[PDB]
Amino acid sequence: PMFIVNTNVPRASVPDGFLSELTQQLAQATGKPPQYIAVHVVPDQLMAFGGSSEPCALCSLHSIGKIGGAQNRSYSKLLCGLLAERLRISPDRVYINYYDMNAANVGWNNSTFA
Template sequence: MPMFVVSTNVAKSEVPAALLSEATEELAKALGKPAEKFAVHVNADQMMMFGGKGDPCAICSLTSIGKIGSDYNKQYSKLLCGLLNKHLGISPERIYINFVDVDATNVGKNYTTIG
């Protein structure tokens, strides 16, 4: 159920499909979870400013059942900032990422919850 959601002011036409597939593959490795369970969502063309400037920026969240915390988050931050810089040209200094650890009973799927 891991989810990576990106909101960015980068134009949709500038978002390559490779970002979504690479994020899925790399996050699956980093979290040790199957790629088939991952969801990646990019909200492009958002009206956003970061530090009072309209340069490319992103606000993100990485949500997972477990594998979130001080032992992991710096690694994820490095990975995700690198991907957003590589594919969207966003400076890592203009990216915020929230890491969210959820209980399996708080995630719904297929008419029920995961836990």
């Protein structure tokens, strides 16, 4: 699984260890070993949310399975919680797009997961 966050928060406000925290919490949330989890944080972005430049985030989570109605509500609570606590972004200024990928459509190590 892979989680990307794009945010207008500056780089200096991303705390030390944040990528390791996201890795751990996503491993636990998706039930997948941490070796399978990739994370990507992109600060200092030119963005607006609802017409305002107040801190916000646009994010995605891709996984082969482990995506669905109840799961995604749970991921949203976890991830918004982390963005609020660590980057001081209000949960109502975050979108997270969830993608249930077919194994045939995910490449890794010279092949695909199908």
